[PDB]
Amino acid sequence: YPAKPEAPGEDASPEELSRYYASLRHYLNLVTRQRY
């Protein structure tokens, strides 16, 4: 389970705070070990 999480976002748009770069977390905190 790699990254590439389209991520949600919405505070501003699909980025809210910079391509939801902040939400990027998902990646190794969504694919990391808990698995999808």
UniProtKB/Swiss-Prot annotation:
InterPro entries: Pancreatic_hormone-like (IPR001955), Pancreatic_hormone-like_CS (IPR020392). It is found in: Secreted. The modification Tyrosine amide is found at residue 36. The record marks 2-3 as: Cleavage. GO terms for molecular function: hormone activity; neuropeptide Y receptor binding. Pfam families: Hormone_3 (PF00159). Coiled coil: none annotated. The modification Phosphoserine is found at residue 13. Keywords: Amidation, Hormone, Phosphoprotein, Secreted. One of its GO terms (cellular component) is extracellular region. SMART domains: PAH. The peptide YY form is cleaved at Pro-2 by the prolyl endopeptidase FAP (seprase) activity (in vitro) to generate peptide YY(3-36). This gut peptide inhibits exocrine pancreatic secretion, has a vasoconstrictory action and inhibitis jejunal and colonic mobility. Belongs to the NPY family. This is Peptide YY. It comes from Sus scrofa.
